[PDB]
Design an enzyme around this catalytic site. Structure first.
Site, short mmCIF file in Angstrom:
data_model
loop_
_atom_site.label_atom_id
_atom_site.label_comp_id
_atom_site.label_asym_id
_atom_site.label_seq_id
_atom_site.Cartn_x
_atom_site.Cartn_y
_atom_site.Cartn_z
N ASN A 115 -7.17 3.63 11.08
CA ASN A 115 -7.10 2.45 10.27
C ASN A 115 -7.45 2.86 8.84
O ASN A 115 -8.59 2.87 8.39
CB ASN A 115 -7.99 1.33 10.70
CG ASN A 115 -7.83 0.14 9.79
OD1 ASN A 115 -7.16 0.16 8.74
ND2 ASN A 115 -8.42 -0.93 10.20
N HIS A 147 -0.46 2.46 2.36
CA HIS A 147 0.67 2.15 1.49
C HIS A 147 0.98 3.17 0.42
O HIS A 147 2.04 2.95 -0.24
CB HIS A 147 0.51 0.75 0.90
CG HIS A 147 0.02 -0.20 1.96
ND1 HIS A 147 0.58 -0.28 3.21
CD2 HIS A 147 -1.10 -0.99 1.97
CE1 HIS A 147 -0.16 -1.15 3.92
NE2 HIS A 147 -1.14 -1.60 3.23
N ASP A 204 0.42 14.05 4.84
CA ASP A 204 0.53 15.47 4.98
C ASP A 204 -0.67 15.95 5.82
O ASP A 204 -0.39 16.87 6.58
CB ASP A 204 0.71 16.24 3.67
CG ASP A 204 2.09 16.04 3.09
OD1 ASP A 204 2.97 15.36 3.67
OD2 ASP A 204 2.44 16.51 2.00
N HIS A 218 -3.70 -1.47 12.13
CA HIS A 218 -4.15 -2.49 11.22
C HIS A 218 -4.38 -3.76 12.01
O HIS A 218 -3.51 -4.15 12.74
CB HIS A 218 -3.11 -2.82 10.08
CG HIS A 218 -2.91 -1.59 9.27
ND1 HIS A 218 -3.64 -1.31 8.15
CD2 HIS A 218 -2.11 -0.51 9.45
CE1 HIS A 218 -3.28 -0.11 7.68
NE2 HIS A 218 -2.37 0.42 8.47
N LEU A 219 -5.43 -4.55 11.76
CA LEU A 219 -5.78 -5.77 12.42
C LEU A 219 -4.98 -6.97 12.05
O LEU A 219 -4.55 -7.70 12.92
CB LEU A 219 -7.27 -6.11 12.08
CG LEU A 219 -8.31 -5.27 12.87
CD1 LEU A 219 -8.47 -3.93 12.17
CD2 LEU A 219 -9.63 -5.99 12.89
N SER A 220 -4.84 -7.26 10.71
CA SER A 220 -4.05 -8.39 10.35
C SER A 220 -2.57 -8.08 10.43
O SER A 220 -2.07 -6.97 10.44
CB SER A 220 -4.34 -8.87 8.92
OG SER A 220 -4.08 -7.79 8.09
N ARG A 252 2.09 -4.23 1.18
CA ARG A 252 1.57 -3.91 2.52
C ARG A 252 2.64 -3.78 3.61
O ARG A 252 2.25 -3.50 4.76
CB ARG A 252 0.54 -4.94 2.99
CG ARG A 252 -0.58 -5.26 2.02
CD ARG A 252 -1.59 -6.22 2.67
NE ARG A 252 -2.49 -6.80 1.70
CZ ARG A 252 -3.55 -6.18 1.20
NH1 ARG A 252 -3.89 -5.02 1.61
NH2 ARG A 252 -4.22 -6.78 0.21
#
Lengths: 136, 141, 141, 141, 141, 143, 141, 141, 141, 141, 141, 141
Positions: F73, F79, F86, F99-101, F110
């Protein structure tokens, strides 16, 4: 009721370039309005500021605006902000089918904050917007 | 000194809606406060507002012989009036562009100023206080 | 009140070049002036500078329990650090973004801030005076 | 005269969610209200709705021998269905595209129709009344 | 014949920003030279300058009944005024757009005209001579 | 196996705000629930959070000799950090981006990850359960 | 003279993968070659690597007082680190950007450097030899 | 609970090419495993595959009265079917978008979903396991 | 070894104007230096310049039977000549692209090469020394 | 050899308009001329037309067990149907995309095919002969 | 004065098609007119036309020692020849770029010149008269 | 009749690379087959290949008085040569553009032809057969 018919730059020149002139159209809408018992006032200017002045002053005199801003549709964020600053319902109108013409005509920066828009239905578009406004 | 506070289209409508964004105030309330400000700061200010791009252009042109600085809030003209941009560039006075709400949090078209590149600077998002801040900068110069 | 003046990468190099762009003042010079500014305003300031994006973030997070506002000059991170953007959004204090030079007259990449949309506002182009104007705004809050 | 009211995917759901953007009725309500208007003017309307692009195409092609005009609300197919566009161009009847909510105020992808360039015109944002207005235009035709 | 020399926003500032011992060339200077040029080709010219878009539009419409041609330097409105574009298209006279500096060598936003597609042609970068060259083209029509 | 749960900038502030978008819980809350799932399933997890891109890159490089998989996370670093991209490519362990949302419902910047092309996969919008889901995929894959 | 060989994120991983893309040698193998390479030209080199953007910025800032030039391999930070760009612009030493693999044959995002505009130049695609070629250029200045 | 597993165009072809990107298993294989996994965790699943956009839209609309959640693998319709997007928006059930192969490592057009913004979430790149993970999320809600 | 130094349009003009960006030596001076250089690494070179795209292509094709590598400076053809790109791809010899000035600091159109993706690599901004460096690389090949 | 001639939406409407852009054979005319041709070469043709995307997808999938090649004229679905693209990729037969009019001379949206990258090739602008030319190509495979 | 009128690809085909766009005349006709007009202002002109880009560049380079100005009509090379742009930059003579038809009313690719930024200016849309006007400018200087 | 087979830059190198894409054959192989094919239908062909854009343009212009049709494989000039586009438009004979490999499956720059809009049509991906298919299409003109 009483509505303002607001026309922008070059709308006065309908005809040298429908087959109607602006005057022809206004006469028909005056005739169209008396029949349905509704007042209309017409105003045309080539000046972006004159249209913004009229939109701000509309609030104390009319219950709706029918707006044909001409090519200002495509770039005047100052007229967009004037429409959002008033509480009356506004309907954007264009006689020709913009989407079949040059690409810069295919977006209106004014429509997002108006009630809606009518494109391509010729001078009838003004009567249809007057009818919509009656229903509010 | 004496400065011109020039306000463009729809700036006269401050107060008729969405106060969180723009403030509780009217243009006249701000004007009154800038007048205390002005007189405690012991300086002069002239205010002018117009919905016409050409009226702002004529004022910028004419300013050169009467003021020592301009605080300009052009309204939405900021995003597309290359003619007001060229007006600012044709004069010798320092011009400060000012917007009350945080443009960067609003619609994407408001995120760019065509006037700012040729001005001294810009202040965005700090409410009506921004006019005061701009006047201070000008004094300081 | 006590505010944090937070400076990003390369802000420590002010003074070595292009005084017509950035002023002749070093960061140390400006820090001295602002502490003078602060005492005349009956307030407190803490200064911190780093070249590390993570340090800035860590300081923003920690700011919440110690200061009542932040004046942030993130240097070039303004243009691309979505991480510092999200840090500003995760705290309750008012943050003003400041830049000395007129970014809009410079390279195109410098014309957008990814931090500004979530901050209170931004001042660009007003030189080192922009730190003071930002502190005045924060006082008015 | 006989007109075809053609409705695309999801238009049958007018109800499920939010009245503020779409109005409170149902597609069935709208149909009911549209038949009282037409019987007075000696005008017939036939209604058809489908979630499948091909059914709209099939209907448009078959319309030519039965109707004198179409009122088309294609749903989100407006924004990418070039196949419905080419169908409209291949028939001689006048077609008016209609949408009830103000698309221009919603997501970016809803701001362009690939169908409108080849239609007589379009009505957007004027609610279920748009269907009636489009029928009246067809009568002026 | 008789032609309209129509100049838009900021064109009246030609010379501003140049000291004055060498002065530049003012719009006044240019008009004097053009009145002499014309005098020598036995033609009439009328001059009109304004900083308002609407006043140029008004003049282009009214031109039709009084001139046989227009030489237009719309200043910065060249890059964005579709409304001037549409004035030009609605009259039957020949219009030539003219700019003194080489816009192709300046900011990117100056590299396009929205008015040139509907005019006869355009002259860019040949200095004040451009207005004479445009008058000559118009006389050859 | 033993997996590394690697959390990027601002992930420590979960709870600061909007439970609707993120969920009511804090990162401490989530770590506790993950530990109980692990022992139970007879596995080990090690948690690390930092606000520094470089620290995430150091951890990814060192993971190779100690873990059998990473659940990442990266915060907003997803982004734009081609450097973290790399790093994931230069190691042999499976990584899963989480990612949670629901990013796709939020700001446009995003909507793209520069890390995901080189990872095993990505899980977005399923709240804190996404960490568990990721651990399950890694368990299903046989460290 | 004495130069700094500055290596950015992941450059320490030359070897875990793709030897046709980045050769098979390790960063340690390369340092040894540049090591003997330098003995033989009677020049000194110092090597420093870090996965932290701030460490490369700190090193660049500090370089000014100890080295006469820098060979920089920033790794993927080349494609987005405006902060490392501004650091290179803040010092007087000549910096050369170097990449081993042919970036122009790989992902699109690798085809632009934001650091190169402010450097003396760049070498891409010539493998580890590029480090020697940059040291030679620096020697010829 | 009972959930719908809804598969779009070409998902029935899992297997006549590339097991290294998609699997080795067929759709039938995956249905069998899911059915068994369903049983283990005591949930009912219904499967439905179709190559027609319209059929998935009809199924979505009908799901509301029969299932408590949908796991949707729309195949390439993910990248351009705003009609399916609007279908998902018009229902109250939680939807989870799932893709077996890692789309982000494939053609650029596959890197955006027009459906995911209005769904609960999306799982990509975790093979046929993603279906199970999406079923577990749905039990959690 | 025997290498071809191929120069494209305008490279023969090094000197008529601005030495600041690319130096004050002419093409003749550079060729003399390189001759001197080849002698000293005991290797042969052949030089060819032309202002025609086609001539460069013809040279590249014929190179394969006579040289063991090519140092190409295509002038502005680097930015748009996909036909030279394809010529380089159609031969087995190693090609190095070279440009003397720092293109990245110049106009935007000079920031991409359509040839470099298919060449061994590129050297930009190191002046006339860049030819020598490319010869050294090639020997290393 | 048995080939499938698959035709998409609106291809059944051929010859209802513009015999210049479109040529004048109805689709029946074209079918009739293609069968006489196949009566030696000793091949069979099967024709199928549908206005539904899913029907074309269903036919592509079923083609694998019955035909040895497909001639595909998808109409406007060429420009946006990634679902039909994926269908063609999931079968082993050679597929040729064919369009009668010269798309490159028409609207810009027609200038790209999302199917052609995975097909054997494409024929555009050669009228109805393009179906025969495709069939020849297939025979030569 | 002695001026070079340099014509590029396809300009020799004026007439063999459209006079409605381009003007009734052939290139031969235009040349005869300019030779007279040249004799009346007592000036010398040399004409040269080629379909090869390198022939124009060769001509621009050699012009410096023989002419005092060039009038350039590059044909379609205007929109992509950076090699010609660089050829114009490398000489000291004034160059005026001329096109006969109004490019701005034609295809979009023709709305930009890559050569104009570095020439003195451009004339577009005034037909073959444009050559005479450009000659006048050259003399007027 | 008599057609011209015009081949552009690098087309002479067919056979130096990747045999899947480009086939076994060399251009001489293909010329022999086409000569062999034309004889068995009684049509003449002339072949010409050049790496220079201008030589193709010259051949197109001169074709008008000698051939009744042109089959053109411009190589990579297809993607940027607006000069060859205008050459095709300036002649009356039918031109067919042909490319052997499937361009749509290759680099993105190869996905657009600037010549194609003004030609009769284009054939892509069908290998050497394409030339024969084009010659057959030309027989119907």
């Amino acid at each position: 009721p009483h509505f303002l018919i607001l026309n922008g730059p070059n709308v006065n020149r309908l005809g040298s370039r429908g087959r109607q002139t602006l005057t022809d159209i206004e006469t028909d809408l005056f005739q169209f309005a008396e029949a349905l018992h509704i007042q209309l006032t017409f105003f045309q200017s080539n000046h972006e500021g004159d249209l913004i002045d009229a939109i701000h002053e509309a609030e104390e005199q009319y219950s709706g605006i029918v707006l044909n801003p001409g090519a200002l549709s495509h770039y005047s964020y100052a007229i967009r902000d004037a429409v959002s600053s008033i509480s009356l319902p506004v309907v954007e109108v264009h006689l020709s089918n913009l989407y079949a013409r040059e690409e810069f005509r295919h977006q209106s920066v004014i429509a997002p904050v108006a009630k809606g828009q009518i494109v391509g239905l010729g001078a009838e578009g003004y009567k249809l917007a007057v009818r919509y406004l009656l229903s509010q």
